[PDB]
Design an enzyme around this catalytic site. Sequence first.
Site, short mmCIF file in Angstrom:
data_model
loop_
_atom_site.label_atom_id
_atom_site.label_comp_id
_atom_site.label_asym_id
_atom_site.label_seq_id
_atom_site.Cartn_x
_atom_site.Cartn_y
_atom_site.Cartn_z
CG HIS A 62 -1.87 -1.19 1.17
ND1 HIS A 62 -1.88 -2.23 2.10
CD2 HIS A 62 -2.80 -1.49 0.26
CE1 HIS A 62 -2.82 -3.11 1.76
NE2 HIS A 62 -3.42 -2.66 0.63
CG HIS A 92 2.71 5.85 5.80
ND1 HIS A 92 2.37 5.75 7.11
CD2 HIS A 92 1.65 6.42 5.18
CE1 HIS A 92 1.14 6.27 7.28
NE2 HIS A 92 0.67 6.69 6.09
CG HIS A 94 -0.83 8.47 1.63
ND1 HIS A 94 -1.56 7.31 1.61
CD2 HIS A 94 -0.55 8.71 2.94
CE1 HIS A 94 -1.72 6.89 2.87
NE2 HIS A 94 -1.11 7.72 3.71
CD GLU A 104 -4.10 9.51 2.35
OE1 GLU A 104 -3.84 9.49 3.57
OE2 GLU A 104 -4.62 8.56 1.73
CG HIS A 117 0.15 10.42 6.73
ND1 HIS A 117 -0.81 9.68 6.04
CD2 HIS A 117 -0.11 11.74 6.53
CE1 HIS A 117 -1.63 10.55 5.48
NE2 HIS A 117 -1.22 11.82 5.75
CB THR A 196 -6.14 8.05 5.20
OG1 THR A 196 -4.82 7.53 5.02
CG2 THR A 196 -6.15 9.34 5.97
CB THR A 197 -5.21 2.60 4.77
OG1 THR A 197 -4.47 2.52 5.99
CG2 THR A 197 -4.39 3.40 3.82
C1 LIG Z 1 6.10 -1.70 12.96
C2 LIG Z 1 5.14 -2.41 13.87
C3 LIG Z 1 3.88 -2.84 13.48
N1 LIG Z 1 3.02 -3.45 14.33
C4 LIG Z 1 1.70 -3.91 13.91
C5 LIG Z 1 0.68 -2.80 13.89
C6 LIG Z 1 0.65 -2.48 12.41
N2 LIG Z 1 -0.59 -1.83 11.93
C7 LIG Z 1 -0.72 -0.74 11.19
C8 LIG Z 1 -2.09 -0.54 10.99
C9 LIG Z 1 -2.79 0.55 10.23
O1 LIG Z 1 -2.23 1.73 10.79
C10 LIG Z 1 -2.37 2.92 10.13
C11 LIG Z 1 -3.15 3.07 8.99
C12 LIG Z 1 -3.21 4.33 8.39
C13 LIG Z 1 -2.53 5.43 8.90
S1 LIG Z 1 -2.66 7.00 8.18
N3 LIG Z 1 -2.52 6.84 6.60
O2 LIG Z 1 -1.54 7.74 8.69
O3 LIG Z 1 -3.98 7.49 8.53
C14 LIG Z 1 -1.74 5.23 10.04
C15 LIG Z 1 -1.67 3.99 10.65
N4 LIG Z 1 -2.71 -1.51 11.64
N5 LIG Z 1 -1.82 -2.37 12.28
C16 LIG Z 1 0.87 -3.82 11.72
C17 LIG Z 1 1.46 -3.72 10.31
O4 LIG Z 1 2.69 -2.97 10.29
O5 LIG Z 1 1.79 -4.46 12.58
C18 LIG Z 1 3.40 -3.70 15.63
O6 LIG Z 1 2.60 -4.27 16.39
N6 LIG Z 1 4.62 -3.32 16.05
C19 LIG Z 1 5.49 -2.68 15.27
O7 LIG Z 1 6.59 -2.39 15.77
ZN LIG Z 2 -1.01 7.70 5.73
#
Ligand SMILES: Cc1cn([C@H]2C[C@H](n3cc(COc4ccc(S(N)(=O)=O)cc4)nn3)[C@@H](CO)O2)c(=O)[nH]c1=O
Ligand SMILES: [Zn+2]
Length: 258
Positions: A62, A92, A94, A104, A117, A196-197
Amino acid sequence: HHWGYGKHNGPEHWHKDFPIAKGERQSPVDIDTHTAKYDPSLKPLSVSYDQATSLRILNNGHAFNVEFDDSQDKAVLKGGPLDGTYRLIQFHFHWGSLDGQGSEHTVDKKKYAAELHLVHWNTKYGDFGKAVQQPDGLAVLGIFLKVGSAKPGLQKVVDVLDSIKTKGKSADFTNFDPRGLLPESLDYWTYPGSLTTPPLLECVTWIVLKEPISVSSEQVLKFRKLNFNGEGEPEELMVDNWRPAQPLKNRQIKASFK
Ligand SMILES: Cc1cn([C@H]2C[C@H](n3cc(COc4ccc(S(N)(=O)=O)cc4)nn3)[C@@H](CO)O2)c(=O)[nH]c1=O
Ligand SMILES: [Zn+2]
Protein backbone atom coordinates in the site's frame (compact mmCIF):
# COMPACT_ATOMS: atom_id res chain seq x y z
CA HIS A 1 -10.25 -9.44 -3.57
CA HIS A 2 -8.44 -7.20 -0.98
CA TRP A 3 -8.78 -3.39 -0.70
CA GLY A 4 -6.39 -1.16 -2.64
CA TYR A 5 -6.31 1.82 -4.99
CA GLY A 6 -7.44 0.17 -8.27
CA LYS A 7 -10.71 0.66 -10.19
CA HIS A 8 -12.22 -2.46 -8.66
CA ASN A 9 -10.91 -2.19 -5.06
CA GLY A 10 -10.26 1.55 -4.48
CA PRO A 11 -11.66 4.02 -1.96
CA GLU A 12 -15.25 3.98 -3.35
CA HIS A 13 -15.42 0.20 -2.55
CA TRP A 14 -13.91 0.22 0.96
CA HIS A 15 -17.26 0.78 2.75
CA LYS A 16 -18.41 -2.76 1.78
CA ASP A 17 -15.76 -4.39 4.03
CA PHE A 18 -15.26 -1.37 6.36
CA PRO A 19 -18.64 0.35 6.89
CA ILE A 20 -16.98 3.02 9.13
CA ALA A 21 -15.75 4.41 5.74
CA LYS A 22 -19.07 6.40 5.82
CA GLY A 23 -18.59 7.39 9.51
CA GLU A 24 -18.76 10.72 11.33
CA ARG A 25 -15.02 11.45 11.61
CA GLN A 26 -13.31 10.11 8.48
CA SER A 27 -10.02 11.35 7.03
CA PRO A 28 -8.61 12.97 5.02
CA VAL A 29 -10.56 16.24 4.63
CA ASP A 30 -10.23 19.45 2.70
CA ILE A 31 -8.81 22.20 4.92
CA ASP A 32 -10.76 25.36 4.12
CA THR A 33 -8.21 27.93 5.33
CA HIS A 34 -10.73 30.76 5.63
CA THR A 35 -13.14 28.65 7.83
CA ALA A 36 -10.47 27.12 10.11
CA LYS A 37 -10.50 29.00 13.40
CA TYR A 38 -7.40 30.26 15.14
CA ASP A 39 -7.42 28.74 18.63
CA PRO A 40 -5.12 30.82 20.88
CA SER A 41 -5.41 28.03 23.56
CA LEU A 42 -3.49 25.59 21.22
CA LYS A 43 0.11 25.05 22.33
CA PRO A 44 3.22 24.83 20.19
CA LEU A 45 3.86 21.34 19.01
CA SER A 46 6.72 19.54 20.81
CA VAL A 47 8.52 17.20 18.38
CA SER A 48 11.29 15.32 20.27
CA TYR A 49 13.07 13.06 17.74
CA ASP A 50 16.75 13.36 18.90
CA GLN A 51 16.75 9.77 20.36
CA ALA A 52 14.74 8.17 17.51
CA THR A 53 15.76 4.60 16.62
CA SER A 54 14.68 3.61 13.11
CA LEU A 55 14.83 -0.14 12.53
CA ARG A 56 13.47 -1.23 9.15
CA ILE A 57 11.71 -0.18 5.94
CA LEU A 58 8.84 -2.32 4.60
CA ASN A 59 6.84 -2.34 1.35
CA ASN A 60 3.43 -3.43 2.67
CA GLY A 61 1.67 -3.38 -0.73
CA HIS A 62 0.00 0.00 0.00
CA ALA A 63 3.00 2.26 0.80
CA PHE A 64 6.41 1.87 2.40
CA ASN A 65 6.80 2.26 6.14
CA VAL A 66 9.95 3.35 7.97
CA GLU A 67 9.51 1.68 11.36
CA PHE A 68 10.91 2.75 14.75
CA ASP A 69 11.61 1.18 18.13
CA ASP A 70 8.56 2.29 20.16
CA SER A 71 9.41 0.20 23.30
CA GLN A 72 10.60 3.41 25.15
CA ASP A 73 9.98 7.24 24.91
CA LYS A 74 12.66 7.80 22.22
CA ALA A 75 10.78 9.81 19.56
CA VAL A 76 7.69 11.55 20.95
CA LEU A 77 5.11 14.11 19.99
CA LYS A 78 3.50 16.21 22.74
CA GLY A 79 1.82 19.58 23.11
CA GLY A 80 -0.32 21.18 20.45
CA PRO A 81 -3.86 19.78 20.83
CA LEU A 82 -2.55 16.63 22.59
CA ASP A 83 -2.95 15.47 26.18
CA GLY A 84 0.02 13.29 27.22
CA THR A 85 2.76 11.61 25.22
CA TYR A 86 2.58 9.98 21.78
CA ARG A 87 5.36 7.67 20.57
CA LEU A 88 6.53 7.46 16.95
CA ILE A 89 5.99 3.96 15.50
CA GLN A 90 6.39 4.57 11.74
CA PHE A 91 6.22 7.06 8.92
CA HIS A 92 5.04 6.61 5.35
CA PHE A 93 3.92 8.66 2.36
CA HIS A 94 1.01 8.87 -0.08
CA TRP A 95 1.82 10.11 -3.59
CA GLY A 96 0.51 10.52 -7.11
CA SER A 97 1.22 9.34 -10.64
CA LEU A 98 1.63 13.09 -11.55
CA ASP A 99 3.00 16.07 -9.63
CA GLY A 100 -0.55 17.60 -9.60
CA GLN A 101 -1.99 14.98 -7.22
CA GLY A 102 -0.95 12.65 -4.41
CA SER A 103 -1.84 14.29 -1.10
CA GLU A 104 -4.71 13.03 1.04
CA HIS A 105 -5.52 16.30 2.79
CA THR A 106 -6.09 19.27 0.50
CA VAL A 107 -5.80 22.99 1.29
CA ASP A 108 -8.56 25.10 -0.30
CA LYS A 109 -8.95 22.09 -2.68
CA LYS A 110 -5.23 22.21 -3.64
CA LYS A 111 -3.63 18.77 -3.99
CA TYR A 112 0.08 18.44 -3.24
CA ALA A 113 2.39 15.93 -4.97
CA ALA A 114 2.60 13.78 -1.82
CA GLU A 115 1.93 13.73 1.92
CA LEU A 116 4.13 12.38 4.74
CA HIS A 117 2.42 10.78 7.76
CA LEU A 118 4.43 10.41 11.00
CA VAL A 119 2.31 8.00 13.08
CA HIS A 120 2.36 8.16 16.88
CA TRP A 121 0.37 6.28 19.57
CA ASN A 122 -0.78 7.49 22.98
CA THR A 123 1.39 5.86 25.66
CA LYS A 124 -1.56 5.72 28.12
CA TYR A 125 -2.89 2.75 26.04
CA GLY A 126 0.32 0.68 26.32
CA ASP A 127 0.69 -0.40 22.65
CA PHE A 128 -0.40 0.57 19.15
CA GLY A 129 -3.03 -2.18 18.81
CA LYS A 130 -4.87 -0.99 21.95
CA ALA A 131 -4.43 2.68 20.97
CA VAL A 132 -6.26 2.31 17.62
CA GLN A 133 -9.38 1.21 19.57
CA GLN A 134 -9.55 4.61 21.35
CA PRO A 135 -10.83 7.99 20.09
CA ASP A 136 -7.57 9.67 21.22
CA GLY A 137 -5.30 6.72 20.47
CA LEU A 138 -3.13 8.13 17.66
CA ALA A 139 -1.61 11.44 16.61
CA VAL A 140 -0.60 11.64 12.96
CA LEU A 141 1.64 14.52 11.90
CA GLY A 142 0.96 15.23 8.23
CA ILE A 143 3.39 17.16 6.06
CA PHE A 144 2.77 18.14 2.43
CA LEU A 145 5.38 17.59 -0.29
CA LYS A 146 5.72 19.83 -3.34
CA VAL A 147 8.14 19.24 -6.22
CA GLY A 148 11.01 21.72 -6.43
CA SER A 149 14.38 21.60 -4.68
CA ALA A 150 15.53 18.24 -3.30
CA LYS A 151 15.04 17.39 0.38
CA PRO A 152 18.51 16.20 1.41
CA GLY A 153 17.16 14.34 4.47
CA LEU A 154 14.86 12.24 2.23
CA GLN A 155 17.64 10.86 -0.01
CA LYS A 156 18.58 7.91 2.30
CA VAL A 157 14.94 6.76 2.01
CA VAL A 158 14.88 7.19 -1.79
CA ASP A 159 18.07 5.19 -2.25
CA VAL A 160 16.86 2.07 -0.33
CA LEU A 161 13.60 1.79 -2.34
CA ASP A 162 15.23 -0.40 -5.04
CA SER A 163 15.72 -3.06 -2.29
CA ILE A 164 11.98 -3.11 -1.34
CA LYS A 165 10.42 -2.85 -4.80
CA THR A 166 7.60 -5.33 -4.20
CA LYS A 167 4.99 -6.11 -1.54
CA GLY A 168 6.38 -7.96 1.48
CA LYS A 169 10.02 -6.92 1.02
CA SER A 170 11.79 -5.30 3.97
CA ALA A 171 15.30 -3.99 4.55
CA ASP A 172 17.37 -2.92 7.55
CA PHE A 173 17.03 0.86 7.98
CA THR A 174 18.88 2.01 11.08
CA ASN A 175 20.07 5.49 12.14
CA PHE A 176 17.61 7.42 9.97
CA ASP A 177 16.83 10.82 11.51
CA PRO A 178 13.24 11.95 10.81
CA ARG A 179 14.12 15.53 11.84
CA GLY A 180 15.49 15.82 8.27
CA LEU A 181 11.91 15.56 6.88
CA LEU A 182 10.43 18.53 8.82
CA PRO A 183 9.81 22.03 7.43
CA GLU A 184 11.06 25.14 9.28
CA SER A 185 7.67 26.12 10.81
CA LEU A 186 5.52 23.91 13.07
CA ASP A 187 2.36 26.02 12.46
CA TYR A 188 -0.51 23.53 12.00
CA TRP A 189 -4.18 22.73 11.56
CA THR A 190 -5.79 20.07 13.73
CA TYR A 191 -9.07 18.11 13.74
CA PRO A 192 -10.36 14.72 14.94
CA GLY A 193 -10.36 12.01 12.25
CA SER A 194 -9.46 8.51 11.22
CA LEU A 195 -6.91 6.24 9.64
CA THR A 196 -6.95 6.95 5.89
CA THR A 197 -6.59 3.23 5.00
CA PRO A 198 -8.63 0.25 6.13
CA PRO A 199 -9.56 -0.41 8.88
CA LEU A 200 -10.38 3.38 8.80
CA LEU A 201 -10.62 3.48 12.62
CA GLU A 202 -11.73 6.80 14.13
CA CYS A 203 -8.76 7.05 16.50
CA VAL A 204 -6.63 9.92 15.14
CA THR A 205 -5.91 13.47 16.22
CA TRP A 206 -4.67 14.91 12.92
CA ILE A 207 -1.97 17.61 13.04
CA VAL A 208 -1.30 18.93 9.51
CA LEU A 209 1.59 21.35 9.08
CA LYS A 210 0.92 24.48 7.03
CA GLU A 211 4.43 24.64 5.48
CA PRO A 212 5.15 22.00 2.83
CA ILE A 213 8.59 20.47 2.31
CA SER A 214 10.14 20.55 -1.16
CA VAL A 215 11.39 17.32 -2.78
CA SER A 216 12.94 17.01 -6.23
CA SER A 217 11.26 15.54 -9.31
CA GLU A 218 13.89 12.75 -9.18
CA GLN A 219 13.02 11.91 -5.55
CA VAL A 220 9.26 11.51 -6.25
CA LEU A 221 10.00 9.63 -9.52
CA LYS A 222 11.75 6.98 -7.39
CA PHE A 223 8.63 6.62 -5.18
CA ARG A 224 6.68 5.92 -8.41
CA LYS A 225 9.00 2.96 -9.34
CA LEU A 226 7.75 0.94 -6.37
CA ASN A 227 5.24 -1.85 -6.97
CA PHE A 228 1.90 -2.68 -5.32
CA ASN A 229 2.38 -6.34 -6.36
CA GLY A 230 4.56 -9.05 -4.87
CA GLU A 231 7.61 -10.45 -6.68
CA GLY A 232 6.53 -12.98 -9.34
CA GLU A 233 3.20 -11.14 -9.93
CA PRO A 234 2.27 -8.75 -12.76
CA GLU A 235 3.93 -5.35 -12.19
CA GLU A 236 1.59 -2.55 -11.07
CA LEU A 237 3.30 0.70 -10.14
CA MET A 238 2.67 1.98 -6.62
CA VAL A 239 1.17 5.39 -7.54
CA ASP A 240 -2.03 7.22 -6.53
CA ASN A 241 -2.11 5.50 -3.12
CA TRP A 242 -4.20 8.35 -1.63
CA ARG A 243 -7.75 8.48 -0.34
CA PRO A 244 -9.69 11.57 -1.47
CA ALA A 245 -11.17 14.13 0.92
CA GLN A 246 -14.14 12.93 2.99
CA PRO A 247 -17.12 14.87 4.35
CA LEU A 248 -16.22 17.14 7.28
CA LYS A 249 -19.62 16.50 8.97
CA ASN A 250 -19.84 17.88 12.53
CA ARG A 251 -16.15 18.93 12.85
CA GLN A 252 -14.18 22.13 13.20
CA ILE A 253 -10.63 22.48 11.98
CA LYS A 254 -8.53 24.63 14.32
CA ALA A 255 -5.43 26.63 13.39
CA SER A 256 -2.42 27.13 15.69
CA PHE A 257 -1.61 30.41 13.87
CA LYS A 258 -3.12 33.71 12.67
C1 LIG B 1 6.10 -1.70 12.96
C2 LIG B 1 5.14 -2.41 13.87
C3 LIG B 1 3.88 -2.84 13.48
N1 LIG B 1 3.02 -3.45 14.33
C4 LIG B 1 1.70 -3.91 13.91
C5 LIG B 1 0.68 -2.80 13.89
C6 LIG B 1 0.65 -2.48 12.41
N2 LIG B 1 -0.59 -1.83 11.93
C7 LIG B 1 -0.72 -0.74 11.19
C8 LIG B 1 -2.09 -0.54 10.99
C9 LIG B 1 -2.79 0.55 10.23
O1 LIG B 1 -2.23 1.73 10.79
C10 LIG B 1 -2.37 2.92 10.13
C11 LIG B 1 -3.15 3.07 8.99
C12 LIG B 1 -3.21 4.33 8.39
C13 LIG B 1 -2.53 5.43 8.90
S1 LIG B 1 -2.66 7.00 8.18
N3 LIG B 1 -2.52 6.84 6.60
O2 LIG B 1 -1.54 7.74 8.69
O3 LIG B 1 -3.98 7.49 8.53
C14 LIG B 1 -1.74 5.23 10.04
C15 LIG B 1 -1.67 3.99 10.65
N4 LIG B 1 -2.71 -1.51 11.64
N5 LIG B 1 -1.82 -2.37 12.28
C16 LIG B 1 0.87 -3.82 11.72
C17 LIG B 1 1.46 -3.72 10.31
O4 LIG B 1 2.69 -2.97 10.29
O5 LIG B 1 1.79 -4.46 12.58
C18 LIG B 1 3.40 -3.70 15.63
O6 LIG B 1 2.60 -4.27 16.39
N6 LIG B 1 4.62 -3.32 16.05
C19 LIG B 1 5.49 -2.68 15.27
O7 LIG B 1 6.59 -2.39 15.77
ZN1 LIG C 1 -1.01 7.70 5.73
